[PDB]
Design an enzyme around this catalytic site. Structure first.
Site, short mmCIF file in Angstrom:
data_model
loop_
_atom_site.label_atom_id
_atom_site.label_comp_id
_atom_site.label_asym_id
_atom_site.label_seq_id
_atom_site.Cartn_x
_atom_site.Cartn_y
_atom_site.Cartn_z
N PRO A 1 0.82 -1.22 0.00
CA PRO A 1 0.00 0.00 0.00
C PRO A 1 0.87 1.30 0.00
O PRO A 1 2.09 1.28 0.18
CB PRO A 1 -0.73 -0.19 1.38
CG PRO A 1 0.39 -0.71 2.28
CD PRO A 1 1.33 -1.48 1.34
N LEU A 2 0.18 2.38 -0.17
CA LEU A 2 0.78 3.73 -0.09
C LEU A 2 0.21 4.45 1.18
O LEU A 2 -1.01 4.51 1.37
CB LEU A 2 0.45 4.56 -1.32
CG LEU A 2 0.86 6.02 -1.21
CD1 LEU A 2 2.15 6.17 -1.80
CD2 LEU A 2 0.40 6.56 -2.28
N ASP A 37 8.37 -3.31 1.08
CA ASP A 37 7.12 -2.77 0.44
C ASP A 37 6.77 -1.39 1.05
O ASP A 37 5.77 -1.29 1.82
CB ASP A 37 5.97 -3.76 0.67
CG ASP A 37 4.69 -3.30 0.04
OD1 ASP A 37 4.65 -2.39 -0.85
OD2 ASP A 37 3.62 -3.76 0.50
N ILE A 71 -3.77 4.02 0.64
CA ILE A 71 -4.34 3.43 -0.58
C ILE A 71 -3.82 2.00 -0.65
O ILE A 71 -2.59 1.76 -0.59
CB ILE A 71 -3.95 4.17 -1.83
CG1 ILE A 71 -4.42 5.61 -1.79
CG2 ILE A 71 -4.63 3.47 -3.03
CD1 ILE A 71 -3.86 6.35 -3.00
#
Lengths: 130, 129, 129
Positions: A1-2, A37, A71
């Site tokens: 995710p961001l 990540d 997100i």
């Protein structure tokens, strides 16, 4: 995710790094994604540029408040619940930020909605899983 | 919901707070949420940092332009349509912003996608709503 | 769609504009929308304010890294794949930005989630298709 953070000015660079490190760890553990990540932005605000109340829940806010917008591809309800708890526990223990000062909103997308580099859709090509 | 505004620099603090109050009112009026369900951020921009055209519609844009991005649980099409009209009404009346200078985009999420405090998912726990 | 860029400070105004023009073209080429369907923001950051790794993919990022967030009505998988390619192509040619320095995340919404002006829901009224 961001992970996108909205905070007020006033932290040192190390304190901002700390906040980001603490939050990244909570995300990796809640979500089970790779440790690298890691995709995070911070936008710092003057007083006046955030209004963050509590919907009558009795929080607690200060100028240390952290708003996090995520997100992400779909995660289970259990993973999201755990992320929230891990996030506030990390920000408290590692950064000295009250759990009353943490607010999270999450939006979801899917496999075709990410390119991490090179114009590639890595979830579609299968460079990432998936 | 969460209301994120992108605007150009130039407003005084009270002018910013007026835009925020006017928009918050509109949102409460359209969506019917508690008055203290207030979550708003403002990112102010130098010239150059936004380009906002009009898809040939004929709007009108100036340095006063407001771009609003909303994150919200699902509302009805009716509620959305009313929000947009309430929003530009209030910004015109309270702030002197032409409706030509208002742009909104909304994205939706679900009960599990919020935590207002303390690491709790209050829509899931039933503390809200 | 709406394109929101997060970049580090250091570009001249001309370089910012180059980056936006380049990205816009690639969008219009991929999506087939009118050239004036242009809605962009840029937020510039101090060092420290973005951390953008690579999930082990072997990308070589630099301070020129561009994070793009897109809000859009649904496009086909082909159009999305095509956009990512065209975007990196254009950013490399027009701006000298390595494709290793370009990250995109897209979020979708629908017809009732846009107001371009005047508090009108133009996809709903038919002003726009």
């Amino acid at each position: 995710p961001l992970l996108k953070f909205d905070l007020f000015y006033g932290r040192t660079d190390a304190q901002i790094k700390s906040l980001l490190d603490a939050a990244h760890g909570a995300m990796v553990d809640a979500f089970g994604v790779p440790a690298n990540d890691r995709y995070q932005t911070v936008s710092q605000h003057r007083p006046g540029e955030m209004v963050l109340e509590d919907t009558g829940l009795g929080y607690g806010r200060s100028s240390a408040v952290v708003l996090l917008t995520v997100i992400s591809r779909p995660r289970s309800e259990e993973q999201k619940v755990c992320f929230y708890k891990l996030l506030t526990g990390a920000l408290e223990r590692d950064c000295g930020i009250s759990p009353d000062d943490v607010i999270v909103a999450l939006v979801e997308n899917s496999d075709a909605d990410w390119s991490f580099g090179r114009g590639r859709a890595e979830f579609l090509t299968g460079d990432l899983v998936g």
